Design a protein around this ligand. Structure first.
Ligand code: HEA
Ligand code: HEA
Ligand SMILES: CCCCCCCCCCCCCCCC(=O)OC[C@H](COP(=O)(O)OCCN)OC(=O)CCCCCCCCCCCCCCC
Ligand SMILES: CCCCCCCCCCCCCCCC(=O)OC[C@H](COP(=O)(O)OCCN)OC(=O)CCCCCCCCCCCCCCC
Ligand code: CUA
Ligand SMILES: [Ca+2]
Ligand SMILES: [Mg+2]
Lengths: 537, 238, 100, 45, 55
């Protein structure tokens, strides 16, 4: 009877390896639903006027809000921040298991009920209509009558508290379970980044918890927390929300930084340039990304001195990121490059998209400049061309780079490269025309638009269609990899140097890697690190 | 002033702040195009020539920054100062208030816009107010622009500066016009004070941006300049 | 910083003066070809003598292949082969382009 | 217990003829959910 | 007795830096001379014509 063994190995199991795979699967099943939502909303705006629908604006609001919320909180955060950390951080720190296995098991299972209740909420008579950033007066019982947005508030609350509970054990694990002789300074860059995101998320999210609960209480207890007649100021709500929203994207994108800084050296066979400078600049970014929050409130009408104070500091964020990009550029040159490898392809494509997105972000960090682009399609282009080009590319590269370690299989290089090229072209021709659409002075979140905009929407729709074929090809390649029984060696990314004999290398050179995870067999043991690896003190 | 087809630039407008905004945008774009093309060429060239089949030996023994990290810290920061300064003096020019002349009110509840000119209250005791409404598609005048016209169009004289008053009594709205480059938030309870100055005598277009429910996209805003005699005739007409 | 340009040349010549193990020879030979420093005549000649001593043939031809790959132009490689021909003929070394 | 993994952690058995239809049907329904979602809001209309 | 021959890495990086610098500078110069000056000059000419036609 393997059924008891089945459910003990999967449900009543607390091993880190058996949980990250479920993290990836949950991320995938959220991402497919989100991609179809995005496809339907982009197909709505193919041409001006009501199209495929009876002009249902509330339905369009539900669609955009659902796409945003589910793809920002059910696709990227749970499938990148903790999915590739809980599996891999114990391997690089020198520990056999996380500090608290039971909380690690608990954190994962708070998400499925969140997804079901979010779907139920979206399946109400009205559904959430405040968008990704819901606002009190719109959310007020005056507009919505029913259990539509309350469940969305609850889902955000519980997902946030689960993510906070899913990050308490990680910090303890990587602060106390360090290897003998592994100073915190000598820690690998990826775990450095993941710990920075963990501490930032835990420090900031409680504020969201409290603010969201007090805002939600307005619908039931009739509190005057944000009522215009009750003495409440919604600018307080905006300040509370954007004390969280601004660093959230950084804590989402830092794992991409770490995975890129890990992918570049091994496939380049060259050590990373300036590790200490890079990590200290990233620490400066982490500390800096908190005191700037009011760039999302530029046209609300705050005072001149506050605007200058919180707009001047927006620029200084660029300097460490530019230093990081320059360091990666320097690392790429000189050393060998295998440009044909899929992780190398994704890492190379990440840099140009991230830097152009950063340039777009530095475009609109001025109160003098934001007035022409605030709440228009230009900010949509900026934030999309940063998010879906950095976090999605990092996730794809991490999957294609560490998949043999998760399972022990080989994918098809041809199909993977074709998928990468198709996805790159589609996402480049999707968010391209939106730059012009927002540069003309046309707002966002409008199912209908003035007639002199049809061409760029038509150009975007074809790329939106192409992205769906990219998704189909990725699904096919994942299935093929899962059922191809293609074996993998211990360290598939280790090759003999220019002066290694074919008989000396095979017998006196195997079992060497830049990181610990490649030392063990690709399907890792349940109980690894029986004895602690000891380095040079 | 109005959107065109296959547009690449912003538009042709008329407002003292709009010209300065366009100038600053031109300078900032001149700044960033440099860095964008430089990084693109660097990424392309560092890989197209250094592939494995042509460079089987890697100079793995250079991982120290002697004088390069310092220049990395300075030069982009120099560019940052060079772009920050003009924006700073533009903002410090804009934050001042000129000599007030008259005010308008732009209160709007839901899917319609109400305007008031209560400066000219006198013995007649007839303050002027109306409501600008979305014109239906069927009743559009032959040759009209869909989704960008109103029935009771707003009227402001040219070359006269107005200290516009922004207020709302419902869910938050916004008051935007790309040609004039002036925007602020129709936040309920609190009034937002903004200015305006039209140089030409032409029809200007715009609408709200911050979503306010199902029909957030059904309140276009049209303001057109008029001469002094036309303005006086319009005022005495009602 | 650490070693300068010529100091590592002298150090690696001194190291290759006495090597009895194939693994150590390959290790030092790898570590030498990473400083953008093309070995001098004494260094390459002593490396060839060491390869003869530790009794490994393909390392000798790999030396010339790697030097040809590392050198910037054909003229420097031609000068090197002209000045090192007698050695190769003395130790029975066959070049890649003439091997097949 | 000292078992050696067979490099197979798929959460469910996979093979060519039969399981392909199940996998493709699951993919199709989880792709087409938004459809019924958009149809529900325009049922009584 | 030829002696060590070095400097290839620095030569390559110097050449690549030169090409990148000149290409970026030329692109920026083209943008500055093409989009700003003609548009501003045309605006000034049109405004002068409008002021003349006013009276
Ligand atoms: C996904 C991650 C991510 C990242 C990395 C960034 C990066 C940045 N973002 Fe962005 N941003 C978002 C996600 C992100 N943003 C989201 C989601 C929103 C919308 C919020 C919402 O409405 O929900 C948003 C919106 C947003 C706004 C709001 C505009 C509006 O709606 O009115 C502003 C304004 O300041 C801003 C600024 C910046 C800045 C200055 C950076 C900087 O980090 C960029 C720095 C990077 C570079 C500049 C490139 C590298 C640097 C060099 C090559 C050095 C040399 C450069 C020069 C000298 C030119 N972001
Ligand atoms: C997580 C960040 C994220 C991501 C990835 C996306 C992805 C996309 N978004 Fe979205 N979007 C937002 C964040 C994001 N968005 C936010 C915050 C808003 C605002 C919400 C609000 O206004 O309320 C928004 C709103 C928004 C709008 C607003 C509608 C309007 O204003 O008119 C539009 C319309 O164009 C849009 C388009 C897209 C498109 C085309 C994609 C993508 O299709 C682009 C290409 C990407 C893919 C097609 C997916 C690839 C996936 C894989 C290959 C699978 C990998 C799986 C694993 C291995 C686990 N987005
Ligand atoms: C987000 C802000 C909300 C408040 C934060 C608290 C969140 C809930 C409490 C979770 C415990 C926090 C860590 C304690 C330290 C610790 O680790 O306890 C140790 C254990 C795990 O470690 P271990 O036994 O493996 O250690 C190894 C020992 N040598 O914890 C637990 O078993 C937690 C107990 C299960 C509770 C989970 C259900 C949470 C309910 C949330 C709803 C109630 C709050 C609602 C708020 C509106
Ligand atoms: C916005 C753009 C403005 C750009 C302005 C910056 C101008 C200064 C930058 C140049 C400084 C570095 C040159 C090396 C000089 C030198 O010779 O350094 C000395 C070392 C020589 O090797 P060694 O240390 O082992 O010598 C040992 C002595 N015994 O070189 C190197 O290792 C170079 C290795 C890293 C450098 C790679 C550069 C990658 C791109 C850099 C940025 C590209 C800009 C793209 C946009 C224009
Ligand atoms: Cu009115 Cu949005
Ligand atoms: Ca439409
Ligand atoms: Mg706004």
């Amino acid at each position: 009877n393997s059924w008891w063994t089945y459910v003990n190995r999967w449900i009543f199991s607390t091993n880190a390896k058996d949980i990250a795979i479920l993290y990836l699967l949950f991320g995938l099943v959220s991402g497919i639903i989100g991609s179809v939502f995005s496809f339907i909303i982009r197909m709505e705006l193919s041409a001006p006027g009501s199209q495929f629908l009876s002009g249902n604006g509330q339905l369009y609001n539900v669609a955009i809000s659902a796409h945003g919320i589910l793809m920002i909180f059910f696709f990227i955060i749970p499938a990148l921040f903790g999915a590739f950390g809980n599996y891999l951080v114990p391997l690089m720190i020198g520990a056999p298991d996380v500090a608290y296995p039971r909380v690690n098991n608990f954190t994962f299972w708070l998400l499925p009920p969140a997804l079901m209740l979010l779907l139920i909420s979206a399946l109400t008579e009205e559904g959430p209509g405040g968008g990704w950033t819901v606002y009190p007066p719109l959310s007020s019982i005056t507009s919505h009558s029913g259990p539509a947005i309350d469940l969305a508030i609850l889902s955000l609350q519980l997902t946030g508290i689960s993510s906070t509970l899913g990050s308490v054990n990680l910090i303890a694990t990587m602060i106390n379970m360090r290897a003998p002789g592994l100073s915190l300074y000598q820690m690998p860059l990826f775990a450095w980044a993941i710990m920075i995101t963990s501490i930032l998320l835990l420090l900031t999210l409680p504020v969201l918890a409290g603010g969201l609960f007090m805002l939600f209480s307005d619908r039931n207890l009739n509190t005057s927390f944000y009522a215009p007649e009750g003495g409440g100021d919604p600018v307080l709500y905006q300040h509370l929300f954007w004390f969280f929203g601004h660093p959230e994207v950084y804590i989402l994108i830092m794992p991409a930084f770490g995975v890129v800084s890990h992918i570049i050296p091994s496939l380049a066979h060259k050590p990373i340039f300036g590790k200490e400078g890079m990590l200290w600049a990233m620490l400066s970014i982490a500390l800096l990304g908190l005191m700037v929050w009011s760039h999302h409130l530029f046209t609300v009408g705050l005072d001149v001195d506050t605007r200058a104070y919180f707009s001047a500091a927006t620029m200084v964020i660029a300097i460490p990121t530019g230093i990081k990009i320059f360091s990666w550029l320097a690392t790429l040159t000189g050393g060998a490059i295998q440009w044909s490898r899929v992780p190398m392809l994704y890492a190379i494509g990440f840099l140009i998209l991230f830097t152009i997105g950063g340039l777009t972000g530095v475009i609109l960090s001025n109160s003098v400049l934001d007035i022409a682009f605030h709440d228009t399609y230009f900010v949509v282009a900026h934030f999309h061309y940063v998010l879906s080009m950095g976090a999605l590319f990092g996730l794809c590269g991490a999957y294609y780079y560490w998949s043999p370690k998760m399972f022990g299989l080989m994918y098809n290089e041809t199909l993977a490269s074709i998928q990468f090229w198709i996805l790159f072209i589609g996402v480049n021709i999707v968010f391209g025309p939106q730059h012009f659409l927002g540069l003309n002075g046309m707002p966002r979140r409008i199912p209908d638009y003035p007639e002199a905009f049809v061409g760029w929407n038509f150009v975007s729709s074809i790329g939106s269609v192409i992205s769906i074929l990219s998704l189909f090809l990725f699904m096919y390649v994942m299935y093929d990899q899962f059922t191809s029984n293609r074996v993998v060696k211990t360290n598939p990314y280790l090759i003999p140097s220019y002066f290694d004999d074919n008989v000396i290398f095979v017998n006196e050179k195997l079992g060497v890697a830049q990181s610990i995870e490649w030392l063990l067999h690709s399907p890792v043991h349940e109980h690894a690190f029986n004895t602690l690896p000891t380095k040079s003190i | 002033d109005a959107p065109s087809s296959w547009a690449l630039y912003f538009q042709d407008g008329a407002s003292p702040s709009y010209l300065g905004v366009t100038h600053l945008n031109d300078y900032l774009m001149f700044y960033l195009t440099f860095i964008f093309i430089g990084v693109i060429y660097a990424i392309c060239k560092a890989v197209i020539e250094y592939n494995y089949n042509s460079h089987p030996i890697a100079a793995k023994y250079t991982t120290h920054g002697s004088i390069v990290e310092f220049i990395w810290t300075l030069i982009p920061a120099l560019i940052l100062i060079l772009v920050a300064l003009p924006s700073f003096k533009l903002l410090y020019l804009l934050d001042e208030v000129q000599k007030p002349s008259m005010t308008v009110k732009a209160i709007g509840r839901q899917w319609f816009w109400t305007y008031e000119l209560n400066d000219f209250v006198t013995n007649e005791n007839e303050p002027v107010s109306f409501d600008s409404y979305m014109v239906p598609e069927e009743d559009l005048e032959e040759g009209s622009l869909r989704q960008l016209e109103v029935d009771n169009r707003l009227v402001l004289p040219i070359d006269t500066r107005i200290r516009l008053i922004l207020t709302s009594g419902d869910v938050i709205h916004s008051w935007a016009v790309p040609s004039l480059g002036i925007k602020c938030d129709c936040i309920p309870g609190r009034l937002n004070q903004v200015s305006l100055s039209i140089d030409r005598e032409g029809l200007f277009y715009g609408q709200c941006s911050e979503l306010c429910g199902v029909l957030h996209s059904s309140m276009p805003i049209v303001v057109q300049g008029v001469s002094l005699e036309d303005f006086l005739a319009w005022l005495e007409e009602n | 910083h650490g070693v300068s340009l010529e100091e590592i040349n002298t150090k690696y010549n001194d190291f290759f003066s006495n090597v009895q193990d194939q693994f150590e020879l390959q290790r030092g030979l790898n570590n030498c070809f990473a400083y953008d420093i093309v070995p001098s005549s004494d260094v390459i000649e002593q490396a060839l003598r060491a390869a003869r001593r530790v009794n490994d043939f393909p390392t000798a031809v790999r030396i010339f292949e790697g030097i040809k790959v590392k050198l910037p132009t054909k003229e420097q490689y031609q000068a090197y082969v002209k000045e090192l021909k007698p050695v190769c003929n003395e130790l029975g070394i066959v070049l890649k382009e003439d091997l097949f | 217990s000292a078992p050696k993994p067979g490099s197979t952690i798929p959460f469910y058995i996979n093979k060519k003829p039969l399981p392909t239809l199940l996998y493709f049907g699951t993919f199709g329904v989880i792709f087409s959910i938004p459809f019924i979602v958009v149809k529900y809001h325009n049922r009584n209309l | 007795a030829v002696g060590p021959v070095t400097g290839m890495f620095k030569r390559r990086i110097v050449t690549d830096f030169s090409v990148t610098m000149i290409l970026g500078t030329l692109g920026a110069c083209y943008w500055w001379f093409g989009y700003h000056k003609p548009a501003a000059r045309q605006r000034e000419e049109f405004y002068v014509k409008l002021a003349a036609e006013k009276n």
